[PDB]
Enzyme design. Structure first.
Site, PDB file in Angstrom:
ATOM      1  N   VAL B  77      -2.622  -8.465  14.855  1.00 21.49           N
ATOM      2  CA  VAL B  77      -1.947  -7.675  13.783  1.00 21.49           C
ATOM      3  C   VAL B  77      -0.658  -8.402  13.391  1.00 21.49           C
ATOM      4  CG1 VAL B  77      -0.995  -5.433  13.118  1.00 21.49           C
ATOM      5  CG2 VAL B  77      -2.874  -5.521  14.762  1.00 21.49           C
ATOM      6  N   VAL B  79       2.092  -9.160   9.718  1.00 18.88           N
ATOM      7  CA  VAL B  79       2.553  -9.190   8.303  1.00 18.88           C
ATOM      8  C   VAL B  79       3.469 -10.408   8.163  1.00 18.88           C
ATOM      9  CG1 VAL B  79       3.798  -7.892   6.512  1.00 18.88           C
ATOM     10  CG2 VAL B  79       2.303  -6.687   8.106  1.00 18.88           C
ATOM     11  N   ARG B  90       0.792  -0.209   7.392  1.00 19.54           N
ATOM     12  CA  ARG B  90       0.267   1.172   7.216  1.00 19.54           C
ATOM     13  C   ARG B  90      -1.111   1.111   6.540  1.00 19.54           C
ATOM     14  NH1 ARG B  90       1.586   6.381   7.920  1.00 19.54           N
ATOM     15  NH2 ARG B  90       3.575   5.748   8.851  1.00 19.54           N
ATOM     16  N   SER B 113       3.642  -5.186  20.728  1.00 19.36           N
ATOM     17  CA  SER B 113       4.694  -6.239  20.664  1.00 19.36           C
ATOM     18  C   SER B 113       6.079  -5.588  20.768  1.00 19.36           C
ATOM     19  CB  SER B 113       4.581  -7.062  19.406  1.00 19.36           C
ATOM     20  OG  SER B 113       4.869  -6.270  18.262  1.00 19.36           O
ATOM     21  N   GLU B 114       6.254  -4.412  20.157  1.00 23.50           N
ATOM     22  CA  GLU B 114       7.481  -3.574  20.256  1.00 23.50           C
ATOM     23  C   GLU B 114       7.062  -2.125  20.534  1.00 23.50           C
ATOM     24  OE1 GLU B 114       9.372  -6.203  16.523  1.00 23.50           O
ATOM     25  OE2 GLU B 114       9.251  -4.008  16.391  1.00 23.50           O
ATOM     26  N   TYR B 118       3.960   1.926  17.042  1.00 23.68           N
ATOM     27  CA  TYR B 118       2.552   2.409  17.034  1.00 23.68           C
ATOM     28  C   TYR B 118       2.467   3.926  17.277  1.00 23.68           C
ATOM     29  CZ  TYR B 118       0.867  -2.284  16.140  1.00 23.68           C
ATOM     30  OH  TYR B 118       0.580  -3.472  15.531  1.00 23.68           O
ATOM     31  N   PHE B 392      -4.866  -7.926  25.470  1.00 25.43           N
ATOM     32  CA  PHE B 392      -5.691  -8.348  24.312  1.00 25.43           C
ATOM     33  C   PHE B 392      -4.879  -8.108  23.040  1.00 25.43           C
ATOM     34  CE2 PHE B 392      -6.835  -3.911  25.106  1.00 25.43           C
ATOM     35  CZ  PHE B 392      -6.699  -3.364  23.851  1.00 25.43           C
TER      36      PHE B 392
END
Ligand SMILES: O=C(CCCN1CC=C(c2ccc(Cl)cc2)CC1)c1ccc(F)cc1
Ligand SMILES: O=C(CCCN1CC=C(c2ccc(Cl)cc2)CC1)c1ccc(F)cc1
Ligand SMILES: O=C(CCCN1CC=C(c2ccc(Cl)cc2)CC1)c1ccc(F)cc1
Ligand SMILES: O=C(CCCN1CC=C(c2ccc(Cl)cc2)CC1)c1ccc(F)cc1
Ligand SMILES: [Cl-]
Ligand SMILES: [Cl-]
Ligand SMILES: [Cl-]
Ligand SMILES: [Cl-]
Lengths: 392, 392, 392, 392
Positions: B77, B79, B90, B113-114, B118, B392
């Site tokens: 994932v 951007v 989104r 990641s942060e 989520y 993963f």
């Protein structure tokens, strides 16, 4: 030789204390803590100078079910560096345990200077210290967090609101396993430490809510770190309101607190990861002095159905243990043991901080029945998460 | 625009990957992971170059009761830094969730990641990573610890014992909540990482027991630290035997492992404090896609007596939930809600890593009945402690 | 509610101060600074305890052309951590600005705790703090450096030479843009800080020249670092002579000073690189209260030929600005704007620390004429480089 | 003896290079840079092995007024550690300067390994390197900042967009004082460094705008730091757009760049303090070879009115200097000097990086007329701020 100290011995004990404890509170403060030591609560070894000492204080410990036990708090334990490996610690611990058992205390407790010492004397770690550090510059409260709607919290001088702190703490200690009664001398001591010291700690401030308080000070050396010495909250609303105020310390980068593993603080934030665990350690250690008295005194989880087993404590007796409707009956038996463990292991289980299953996996707790293990786990679990009151 | 990528898009996706992920495994390895992505498992945004991407892999997740669920593992994932704050994340998460729900997955999962991203997409942290560092120079095994009596453990080259690692891991992942099936491509990848790289990681070694293995390597920079990448033990005997061997790495000062909060290692030692918690973080995150399918699929604690309630998930439906004999029935209702929570909160409860009581204290879980709270706590608790399989 | 504080409010203000400012000077010293606050110079917010405060002091600021302006020095600004995000800062700043404007101050000034706060209230950073660290072990003076031929500099106790420091500083502050009048109470405060404190700062020493002084002390923790708290030199000879003496502190490795970007120290050495810039930050911030009064009051560069333009300050008026022979005339107009900028931008230009061209490149200053930009740059430039006097 | 090297000498020169320069680019790359060294551009000292070397490259330097000067770029200067304090550097610099002057170069330039060496050979520091570190987690763009309204910036692989980088750089170097022509061999070298190296630098990425580019890579060791190796922007829109993209590197904590003191980046942010100056150093050094040719070649500020003076350069001639309408005439005279300075000082003034007033305050520039000083300051000032192109 091993004796109860006379008034003449206490200067020698303060010398040994100063040489043994880097955090030694000094003779004035030590003389105040002394008021909590009963007659015959202290032993010294003389060679004549003091080369060993140990004492216990009369404490009141809250255990699951909001039950308050008389507790012997071991403290001020030291052997002179000149008299190591001479069995002085074993001799002093044997004598105090004799006196504590004879006096009718069901449990003894201590805070351990090292983790490797007190297991062999039957003490198990019973609470977990959990340091959280919040980078408050990124901290945002979740939409769900209470009190995001005047503020109910006041910034105050601790010495001006003693009555309110005492009353909030008294409510807290009675409802939380690990809670200790804090006598007036320890309130005197706490509010004297709230003062700034030249070359020492900075001034302490208080955040005061009707149902909670936080005591905090800026760190001596790290001027962007605020250390919360103590946060006692009796309601979730109080806990959240106090944390909203602490996150409002806009001159700080970080807020740190020594709390418990089930502190809900992380779940109050949009980013749970901001409340970082920076340190974990054993807190209060327990020695069960009287197995049946201790096991019968605490409440058990109502969610587990009535069950019976036979518990053997290594050189601590064998008991028919029946747990049902949140209560235990614990009677002598010579029937075959279904569960075996050392006395220290029972101490670790007693406030619900450690799972029987985890101790079984390390073979510290032996049984041939996995169903019995699940039932013990469920029964000994504490509804209210175990916390640590104050170090002694 | 938002599309399933063509073969032509993947070089653009690898560029975005390299620029987004400092730990990017590279195009060769990424092409191997690709074999786990189903047809229509990936979305890209084009402006023409790739400025956004997201995919899911077909995984198998073990949940309490040794039940294996088909799981959509969100991954890759990103951007572009040129296209922030344009609602691309989104839009991509909405489309993948549509596809995942329609495909009939009851749960989605990711590694974050942060920690702040989520929650708003319905993901709750479901496992806890717990780093233990042992100062092995002081480590002594407790009298009670198994295997203190030949050694059953062998020091081996990982690439020569693939079959044995695969078989042990397959046993482990089926019996532990958080367990993931590790397909052949991920075994190919793992044993390629076991190699020493010039200017990179040192050679990996394996400690092999019939019922467990440890993979470890000396740290790149700290030559007195051994990092255990992976320890899978199917028995307590295997777990203890492997730790006896790791404590036998006499050239190291410290052994570190990323484990779970209920790792019994500390209780194997005479000094529990030697196994220091040096780091704690969220591991696997879960989004419950289908509330009734997920709640009916997992096993519940047998120790809690049959009970019924009404659960509302915020924009996730309202259900009559009946839990008894370790099983749940979860049916539609318009009856008044007794429990309310956001979808992310249910994810956090689902593998038993977080207590309902703790989430209630943060007001993430709302009920007016404290008895219902204790019953939820007990029922959702996992007999086998939740662990984290592989990232993963 | 928002009020001028009564004598009763000041203990509450000192509590908020102690909790808000890690460098809080304490109630004795704060009571001395209070003598610089005019009647109605302070506002407090009560909830009853003090939850917000702000005040201004009567200052005298030197601007280019050796012009001295009456200046409102904002200070002691704090919102209680219990009352964040309640618009208390905006309300207090609006009221003080109302009082400052009505009282007839052409400019307000402050030192900012953070760089992100005061821009929105019309304050622009107007001076630059520049920390130089000299490794004095390698420092050799250039053949060209003055005073390489008795020494004119004396090592003295600061408290014994107050009259001489006062007279040198008074000469300095009148000739340097950023210069502040230092009243007698601030000389009392400075020379009390020159004392060694137990557990605190070491003794301060002075290097005294007829036309300059340096105040310095050895760092608390780094015993090979001397920190120059203050160097005021009225001649280049004085500046060089004082630096020859500081480089003569043979027991130190490093001399550090907070100076300005145009400090000639590097050019006095054979190796300019030895005077390392170790830190840079905004110093004094200015809010222009009255645009025409401020622009007409300061001198402009004689080197730029007479020119006229139309300046619009965003919600600050539009003015026909004519600059010639080092003087400005600034009159109301409805003529089309040639230059637009926010009020904060004008503050940043006003003492010549920031170039119009640099602010134009960030689009903080809008014009369609590059010739006008060069003319503004040249005109607003200060002949004498802008320095920072003392923090308030 | 001192000679122009033969082809046989270059292996000996590469050995001395490898032993002298920790950042030695290696023989392949050094052989490519060699193509920029003219016939007779190199000297070596032999004892037979190479114990000293120095060369110059044919460069094109942009000076104020967008004037491009032929420039001798001194480089690859080394004395063997076996032959220190033997006057080899002085002998090699004297011979190259003889050749450079005779060849008709008006200026020589270098980057200095140490700040104390090159002043005595007539080199003055002419540009200032300014490292900014942005904590991008807090960075918000000001309402006024351009391009806050698709993105005009693309994330690309540097090797695939060479033509676009070359064209943007060629526009940049012609309009900025300090600009250097970058020949094809140096583009070959730059894009080879953009590659990831095993045990070395990570992969470089490019942000590409029609009117600017940024080259950046994640730091080897600090994986939360992105280092911008190069940002060339021809418009303010390009500069802001590239910084919006860099602040969008959400996996980084910090972005660092080596820029110039007038970089407008701080003014693009709501908090100017977030763009911290972490490092400052001399960049390009200039030796004026021909005083009248150099002074007549550059443009001067139009804002200063016509003026005449007499400039003496120490052992560099005395000149009637007339500056008016942005042009200088510089003719021989025996008239009394009004300004005196060493040759190195003129180099420092020449690109407008250092003020005459600052150098006068250090007595590096002597005059008895303060009006002349202000006129020199204004005239030598650069409209376009001086930047540093690439190290050589
Ligand atoms: O000295 C003690 C108690 C130890 C106090 N500790 C608690 C607070 C700590 C923090 C820091 C460390 C010291 C004492 C002294 C004399 C007695 F009779 C009985 C007891
Ligand atoms: O890149 C991935 C998976 C991420 C692998 N991670 C696991 C191991 C980690 C350690 C270090 C970090 C990376 C990927 C690539 C292409 C796909 F189609 C599907 C998935
Ligand atoms: O407290 C101040 C002024 C702030 C003093 N600062 C200057 C020196 C600093 C150094 C260290 C920091 C504090 C004050 C107090 C009460 C007043 F009425 C008016 C003003
Ligand atoms: O070696 C050089 C040039 C120095 C290159 N530097 C620029 C980039 C740097 C960064 C890192 C340091 C090295 C050279 C070699 C042989 C020549 F003939 C002429 C010139
Ligand atoms: Cl606690
Ligand atoms: Cl795990
Ligand atoms: Cl200054
Ligand atoms: Cl630059």
């Amino acid at each position: 030789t091993l004796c109860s100290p006379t008034e003449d011995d206490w200067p020698g004990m303060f010398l040994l204390a100063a040489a043994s404890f880097t955090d030694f509170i000094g003779p004035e403060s030590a003389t105040a803590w002394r008021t909590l030591v009963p007659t015959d609560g202290a032993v010294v070894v003389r060679d004549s100078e003091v080369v060993g000492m140990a004492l216990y204080m009369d404490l009141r410990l809250t255990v699951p079910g909001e039950v308050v036990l008389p507790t012997a708090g071991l403290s001020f334990v030291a052997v002179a560096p000149t008299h190591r490996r001479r069995g002085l610690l074993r001799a002093m611990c044997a004598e105090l345990h004799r006196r504590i058992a004879d006096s009718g205390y069901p449990v003894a407790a201590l805070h351990a200077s090292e983790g490797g010492i007190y297991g062999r004397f039957g003490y198990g770690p019973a609470t977990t210290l959990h340091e959280l550090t919040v980078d408050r510059r990124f901290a945002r409260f979740h939409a769900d967090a209470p009190g995001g709607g005047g503020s109910s919290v006041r910034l105050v001088r601790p010495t001006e609101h003693r009555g309110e702190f005492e009353a909030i703490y008294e409510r807290w200690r009675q409802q939380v396993p690990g809670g200790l009664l804090r006598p007036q001398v320890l309130w005197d001591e706490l509010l004297a430490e709230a003062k700034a010291a030249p070359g020492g700690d900075r001034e302490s401030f208080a955040l005061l809510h009707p149902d909670g308080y936080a005591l905090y000070r800026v760190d001596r050396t790290d001027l962007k770190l605020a250390r919360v010495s103590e946060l006692r909250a009796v309601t979730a609303d109080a806990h959240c309101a106090l944390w909203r105020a602490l996150i409002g310390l806009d001159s700080m980068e970080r807020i740190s607190i020594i709390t418990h593993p089930q502190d809900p603080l992380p779940h109050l934030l949009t980013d749970t990861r901001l409340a970082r665990t920076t340190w974990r350690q054993d807190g209060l250690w327990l020695r069960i002095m009287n197995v049946p008295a201790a096991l019968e005194a605490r409440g058990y989880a109502h969610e587990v159905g009535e069950f019976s087993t036979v518990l053997e404590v290594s050189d601590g007796g064998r008991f028919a243990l029946k747990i049902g409707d949140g209560r235990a009956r614990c009677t002598p038996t010579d029937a075959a043991a279904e569960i075996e463990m050392d006395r220290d292991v029972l101490g670790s289980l007693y406030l619900g901080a450690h799972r029987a299953s985890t101790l079984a996996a390390a073979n510290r707790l032996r049984t041939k029945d996995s169903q019995l293990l699940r039932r013990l786990d469920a029964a000994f679990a504490s509804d209210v998460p175990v916390q640590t009151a104050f170090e002694f």
